[PDB]
Amino acid sequence: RPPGFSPFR
């Protein structure tokens, strides 16, 4: 869970 991560599914 890195910084600036985006939503999935």
UniProtKB/Swiss-Prot annotation:
| Description of post-translational modifications | Bradykinin is inactivated by ACE, which removes the dipeptide Arg-Phe from its C-terminus.
The protein's name: Bradykinin
Tell me, in a sentence or two, what this protein's role is. Answer: The active peptide bradykinin is a potent vasodilatator that is released from HMW-kininogen shows a variety of physiological effects: (A) influence in smooth muscle contraction, (B) induction of hypotension, (C) natriuresis and diuresis, (D) decrease in blood glucose level, (E) it is a mediator of inflammation and causes (E1) increase in vascular permeability, (E2) stimulation of nociceptors (4E3) release of other mediators of inflammation (e.g. prostaglandins), (F) it has a cardioprotective effect (directly via bradykinin action, indirectly via endothelium-derived relaxing factor action).
Superkingdom of this protein's organism:
Eukaryota
Site features described as Cleavage, chain residue numbers: 7-8
Q: Which organism is it from?
A: Homo sapiens (Human)
Segments spanning the bilayer are none
Q: Which positions carry 4-hydroxyproline?
A: 3
